[model samples]
Target: QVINTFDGVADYLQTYHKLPNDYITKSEAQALGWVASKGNLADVAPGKSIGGDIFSNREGKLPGKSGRTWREADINYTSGFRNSDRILYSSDWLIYKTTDHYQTFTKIR
Candidate 1:
């Protein structure tokens, strides 16, 4: 779960049975101290990401349900670089992984 790989994130979700505390909303992480320009999030929120952020499906890209709300996670994230990969999931347990920063996604579960 410590790793930020796709499967790792899935395993984390399965094990924790929910989004972990390490996954903070973008605004929450920002308030704690996070800058999109500088990926120096470790200073304010150690081992955390601006994850659990809302993903509004404005264009209706991903599979949808009436009450499904999506949240995003930063994939392959590290101290200095944030990769284009991302993990997206819904409150209904539909999980997806995107390598092109949401340009496309594959359902994980």
Candidate 2:
């Protein structure tokens, strides 16, 4: 009943469900929203990084997103990948997940 990106199945195993069984299917990525500025240390390029994934930013510019519902024209220039760092992390759809059934995924964070 969960709305996963896959039409077949999507599931994040419980932490204790670890029996070392081969996975029949892998999970997919979903865009939560735009990234924040200078939150996480996961730099896209060698010397660039941005805020962690959230609904906020540092420059006070409105947050925005791409690769999902984000259109280029709809992007907030003041709050998007201004350099290679942001771009690098943004390309990775990693997020964090807690054992409490809540996902806080961050592939590069």
Candidate 3:
């Protein structure tokens, strides 16, 4: 099993743009690409996927942060619940997006 945790704060504008050709996992067609998939996977809300909202100006807050409060990336996702009541769109992953900065993020599951 693998596990990944989300943390941080920032302003990311979520918009529905056409999927890029590179937005794929090699040629497998069954793997997750660079984009986060959700909603409807069709950009049709109530059936939409792949995007949410815009986040802005804030500090990183996570058990790992120890309340250090730092700037990071905005996931730009909407508000709602994901599988298993994870609290996505409302509460889930808040990351800095940058692979490097201060906090080191690791993938879970």
Candidate 4:
């Protein structure tokens, strides 16, 4: 079903090559009245998590490959404010986890 943990999301992405059914894009969440600054995603959409946002590798922190697009998802979300934990996945099936709000990342798959 909906996996919210780092390991769970990582494994799911590695196997499925896509996000779970519970993930919602930022624009989709916004359409449901979700405000990131106010952290109202959980309130607006129950049991849904934020994901499918393109991650521009501007800082070059992540491994780069030709034509490899990156997408991100939130992990370990329970309610209220979102934590720093995130799962980043590539178009080519690379998976990673960052618990420091993108400051650092660890490869998962």
Candidate 3 lDDT tens digits, 1-109: 1112232122121122222121212122223322235432223322222223332224432333333332222132333432221112223333334244324443321
Candidates 2 and 3, the one with greater lDDT: 3
What is candidate 2's lDDT per residue for 1-109, written digit by digit as tens?
2211111111222222211122111111012222345432222222221222332223323233554211001011122333222211122232222222122222222
TM-score of each: 0.84, 0.18, 0.18, 0.94
How much lDDT does each candidate structure score? 0.79, 0.22, 0.27, 0.89
Angstrom error at residue 67, model 4:
0.6
Clashes of 2: 16
Backbone clashes in candidate 4 total 0
Please provide, for model 1 over 8-85, each residue's C-alpha lDDT reduced to its tens digit, 9 standing for 90 to 100: 888778677576556777788789877868867777777776677789998888988888898888877656656788
For all predictions, the C-alpha RMSD in Å is: 1.9, 17.2, 14.0, 1.0
Clashes of each: 0, 16, 20, 0
TM-score head-to-head 3 vs 4, winner: 4
After superposition, candidate 4 runs with Cα above 4 Å error: none
- Model 4 earns a TM-score of 0.94
Error of model 3, residue 98, in angstroms? 12
lDDT (C-alpha) at residue 76 in model 2 = 11
Arranged by lDDT with the best first, the candidates are 4, 1, 3, 2
Candidate 2: regions farther than 4 A off = 1-21, 26-64, 68-91, 103-108
Q: Give the TM-score (vs. native) of candidate 1.
A: 0.84
